[PDB]
Design a protein around this ligand. Structure first.
Ligand SMILES: *[C@@H]1O[C@H](CO)[C@@H](O[C@@H]2O[C@H](CO)[C@@H](O[C@@H]3O[C@H](CO)[C@@H](O[C@H]4O[C@H](CO)[C@@H](O[C@H]5O[C@H](CO)[C@@H](O[C@H]6O[C@H](CO)[C@@H](O)[C@H](O)[C@@H]6O)[C@H](O)[C@@H]5O)[C@H](O)[C@@H]4O)[C@H](O)[C@@H]3O)[C@H](O)[C@H]2NC(C)=O)[C@H](O)[C@H]1NC(C)=O
Ligand SMILES: *[C@@H]1O[C@H](CO)[C@@H](O[C@@H]2O[C@H](CO)[C@@H](O[C@@H]3O[C@H](CO)[C@@H](O)[C@H](O)[C@@H]3O)[C@H](O)[C@H]2NC(C)=O)[C@H](O)[C@H]1NC(C)=O
Ligand SMILES: *[C@@H]1O[C@H](CO)[C@@H](O)[C@H](O)[C@H]1NC(C)=O
Ligand SMILES: [Fe+3]
Ligand SMILES: [Zn+2]
Ligand SMILES: [Zn+2]
Length: 340
């Protein structure tokens, strides 16, 4: 009754969920699916209660009646007077990243190059960059723009999955979950870092969190921010320090969604759970931390300070914003459980 069933995407999130379940004393239980879309279906069926989603999926879930409940909030400089849970969200910056050594590569010479995407249907990894490319190109053949890519969620036989690597054994190539080596923010950046692709579509934070000794991960240990450059829409290339004047767009933060009829209950439980395992939670450092998973961003992004209330009880369209909503709609024109 007062119990919440979380939906984990893939085996790694499932294992973290199980630890959360155990430490929560069954207040939180786990359901697992192989893809985010499958988790959305479980929630619609009522077999799972909620999960944290990127804005691109919130659009999909929203057309099916699911609503945003609480949003990820990262530590910001401005609005320091208010508490995190009550602080308004600022959104993150979607950027296009390349290696400095790849001189001459600009936004205007991306055609026929190799790309790394977080996953199909995600904000920074797909919707924003492909939406821009389709317009500037006046063509819906976004599957023919880059020569090869790793875009988890696309046809494993297509060029859009040619660069994906699968798991340790080569299985699950291009699956849209953490089993795929180049999945998500971290995976797409790794795809660029190992020179598998020429450009990576991720967010500003990803670059900083995986460079200059911030990761300790084998592939990221020797990465330096100076060896990277951001591609601006004006054909320019800039240092990663200038993301505020060189990004593709500002994206709405990932947020927890649930069926409307379960929203109130999910919100209540989550607020109590973060008070216990959140950043300054009673048991985070010592026993369990909800927002930690060694740079793998499992269940929640690792840079999350807290889950914040929304204020203005927004619908999914108000949460995403008219700007972003129409962008997705237009891109979708090129392409139950598709509920609209
Ligand atoms: C693009 O995204 C980036 C990344 O999200 C944004 O940069 C952050 O912006 C915020 C707000 O403006 C800055 O605010 C500071 O946040 C810090 C916490 O992250 C506070 O600094 C303390 O804590 C840091 C984190 O532990 C720590 O690390 C930082 O500096 C050292 C060396 O200078 C490096 O790493 C150290 O910590 C890591 C953590 O595990 C550890 O591995 C190492 O052993 C080091 O000890 C690393 O460079 C890192 O940046 C600080 O040293 C310090 O102890 C600080 O008080 C304040 O709250 C924040 O600094 C930025 N975060 C990072 C990682 O740089 C950026 O704003 C976005 N751009 C735009 C335009 O939006
Ligand atoms: C790709 O191109 C399409 C076509 O231009 C872009 O869609 C257009 O986006 C703009 C900006 O959001 C919309 O303008 C707004 O219109 C409303 C009223 O319709 C007005 O109140 C606002 O002030 C603003 O002018 C425009 O309507 C919309 N066009 C269509 C047909 O939906 C799309 O955003 C582009 N994609 C990307 C990623 O840039
Ligand atoms: C579990 O939920 C109950 C009911 O609200 C609460 O009293 C208890 O503190 C919770 N314990 C944990 C570990 O979350
Ligand atoms: Fe995202
Ligand atoms: Zn801007
Ligand atoms: Zn409203």
């Amino acid at each position: 009754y007062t119990r919440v069933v979380w939906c984990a995407v893939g085996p790694e999130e499932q294992k973290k969920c199980q630890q959360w379940s155990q430490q929560s004393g069954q207040n939180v239980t786990c359901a697992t699916a192989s893809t985010t879309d499958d988790c959305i279906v479980l929630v619609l069926k009522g077999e799972a209660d909620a999960l944290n989603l990127d804005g691109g999926y919130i659009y999909t879930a929203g057309k099916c009646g699911l609503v945003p409940v609480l949003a990820e909030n990262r530590k910001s400089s401005k609005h320091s007077s208010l508490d995190c849970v009550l602080r308004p969200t600022e959104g993150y910056l979607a950027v296009a990243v390349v290696k400095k050594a790849n001189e001459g590569l600009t936004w205007n010479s991306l055609k026929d190059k190799k790309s790394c995407h977080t996953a199909v249907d995600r904000t920074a990894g797909w919707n924003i960059p492909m939406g821009l490319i389709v317009n500037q190109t006046g063509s819906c053949a976004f599957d023919e723009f880059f020569s090869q890519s790793c875009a988890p969620g696309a046809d494993p036989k297509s060029r859009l999955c040619a660069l994906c690597a699968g798991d340790d054994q080569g299985l699950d190539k291009c699956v849209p979950n953490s089993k795929e080596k180049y999945y998500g923010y971290t995976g797409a950046f790794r795809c660029l870092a190992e020179d598998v692709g020429d450009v990576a579509f991720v967010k500003n934070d990803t670059v900083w969190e995986n460079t200059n000794g911030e990761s300790t991960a084998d592939w990221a240990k020797n990465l330096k921010r100076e060896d990277f450059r951001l591609l601006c829409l004006d054909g320019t290339r800039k240092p990663v320090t200038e993301a505020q004047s060189c990004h593709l767009a500002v994206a709405p933060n990932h947020a927890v969604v649930s069926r409307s009829d379960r929203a109130a209950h999910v919100e209540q439980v989550l607020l109590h759970q973060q008070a216990l395992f959140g950043k300054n939670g009673k048991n985070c450092p010592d026993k369990f931390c909800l927002f930690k998973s060694e740079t793998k961003n499992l269940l929640f992004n690792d840079n999350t300070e807290c889950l914040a209330k929304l204020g203005g009880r927004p619908t999914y369209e108000e949460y995403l914003g008219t700007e972003y909503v129409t962008a997705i709609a237009n891109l979708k024109k090129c392409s139950l459980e598709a509920c609209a």
